[PDB]
UniProtKB/Swiss-Prot annotation, chains A, B:
A GO biological process held by the record: regulation of RNA splicing
Origin organism lineage: Eukaryota, Metazoa, Chordata, Craniata, Vertebrata
Location of Phosphothreonine modifications: 40
Main localization of the protein described in the UniProt heading: nucleus
Tissue: Ubiquitously expressed in all tissue examined. Isoform 1 is expressed at lower levels in brain, skeletal muscle, and liver whereas isoform 3 is intensified in skeletal muscle and in liver.
Part of the full-length chain shown: 144 to 261 of 443
Name under which the protein is recorded: KH domain-containing, RNA-binding, signal transduction-associated protein 1
Crosslink position(s): Glycyl lysine isopeptide (Lys-Gly) (interchain with G-Cter in SUMO2): 32
UniProt keyword terms in alphabetical order: Acetylation, Cell cycle, Cytoplasm, Isopeptide bond, Membrane, Methylation, mRNA processing, Nucleus, Phosphoprotein, RNA-binding, SH3-binding, Transcription, Transcription regulation, Ubl conjugation
GO cellular component assignments: cytoplasm; cytosol; Grb2-Sos complex; membrane; nucleoplasm; nucleus; protein-containing complex
GO molecular function: DNA binding; identical protein binding; molecular function inhibitor activity; mRNA binding; poly(A) binding; poly(U) RNA binding; protein domain specific binding; protein tyrosine kinase binding
Length: 118, 118
């Protein structure tokens, strides 16, 4: 429960941020985040230093393929059942970890709140 | 468990960072953090936007007064029994909250790792 700055173990920070399909029914979030063949999400991870994944129903934008992978029972695909969301995962010592989480959280906001006033 | 960027509720982030008395037995952390009549910790909170408190055994630097307040049984003083630590508390929407936590965490590190290579 306490943080020890001298601990040999890194801390992990993880968040699941819901893609706000409710508020923006027509906006193609998954495409804008992934980018052409994944270049945006690649870049985004590189720029922020975080693992960032799009998960949940609609994350692969292929109602057919999603159906099939779910139905297969395989647990790597379990997420395809959850609300559509962005999953940020960072590790490091406390200062670095929070800094990275903050960087990623805020870049991700820019994507999920697309009409925010620059 | 999910974060909703449009939730009406703020998130809270809290950490307890141990003051590393083990690694720096002689350094007067509590004085350097508090400052003359609390000006450093005041400033620090103002600059970072976080609530920051020094708690635990030695936080008041008055072995006598600490003894007395503990002994009194009063729960506001319960912390005086815990390892000496800095308690950071932030609230806000996810982007702001992480940003604030990161700011505070990292300023606090500068105090708790005093010989870090600038």
């Amino acid at each position: 429960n306490y943080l020890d700055l001298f601990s040999h173990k890194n801390m992990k920070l993880k968040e699941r941020v819901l893609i706000p399909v409710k508020q923006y029914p027509k906006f193609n979030f998954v495409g804008k985040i992934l980018g052409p063949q994944g270049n945006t999400i690649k870049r985004l991870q590189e720029e922020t230093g975080a693992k960032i994944s799009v998960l949940g129903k609609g994350s692969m934008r292929d109602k057919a393929k999603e159906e099939e992978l779910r139905k297969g029972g395989d647990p790597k695909y379990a997420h395809l059942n959850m609300d559509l969301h962005v999953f940020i995962e960072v590790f490091g010592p406390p200062c670095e970890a929070y800094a990275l989480m903050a960087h990623a959280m805020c870049e991700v906001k820019k994507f999920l709140v697309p009409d925010m006033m620059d």
